[PDB]
Design a protein around this ligand. Structure first.
Ligand SMILES: [Cu+2]
Ligand SMILES: [Cu+2]
Lengths: 126, 127
């Protein structure tokens, strides 16, 4: 099973003006053909959120079967062509400021499928 | 003493695209002249912050006697003329995304001076 080991940006509030890519590192290599990744700019509730636990709750319902027209999907392209523990997902332009979730379903080289998510807050501009 | 009773935006990560005013409500009216308000776009450490305690720590260091050339001051004006418990701060331009601290020193009608700050994270843009 491939679990997330590390991610940049991390699960934090970051500035990072000009951020345009997210890097994920898994605990084992994942297989390109059966691994998919999506990202969403999360809608915050009126009057905001106070901690990362609350951020995770927003992100925790998203998945690779999320309906794009029901959310604010960010189109990204992966660098995953073979099998790799590291995955880079890029946008064509800087990511706008916002709270974000990356969600995935990955097939490990060991043959097992896992899902997960990673969330962060981009409090810098373009 | 005029203690902060509420602020909008609150101490939170908010979206608020187009934000360009901050509201403070105090427990007693504050007096112009001796009450002043400033705001700063906070530099985050590399790799960012993980909670509002860390935000408050960043903000807690600033004050009405902060030297603007060592920080990233947001130009704003207050609406405080007539002794009031409610103070609205209008930024010259819409606030960029970022972490912010509002700092003050206020003189209450009761004659006591207090200092404080309020911090929040603006995760929306200017439009
Ligand atoms: Cu496995
Ligand atoms: Cu008093």
């Amino acid at each position: 099973h491939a679990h997330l080991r590390a991610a940049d940006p991390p699960e934090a509030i970051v500035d990072a003006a000009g951020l345009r890519e997210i890097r994920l590192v898994f605990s084992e290599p994942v297989v390109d053909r059966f691994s998919t990744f999506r990202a969403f700019r999360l809608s915050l509730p009126e009057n905001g959120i106070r901690n990362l636990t609350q951020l995770n709750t927003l992100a925790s319902e998203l998945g690779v079967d999320t309906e794009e027209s029901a959310h604010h999907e960010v189109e990204l392209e992966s660098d995953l062509s073979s099998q790799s523990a590291e995955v880079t997902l890029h946008s064509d332009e800087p990511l706008p400021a916002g709270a974000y979730a990356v969600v995935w379903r990955v097939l490990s080289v060991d043959g097992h499928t896992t899902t997960g998510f990673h969330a962060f807050v981009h409090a810098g501009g373009t």
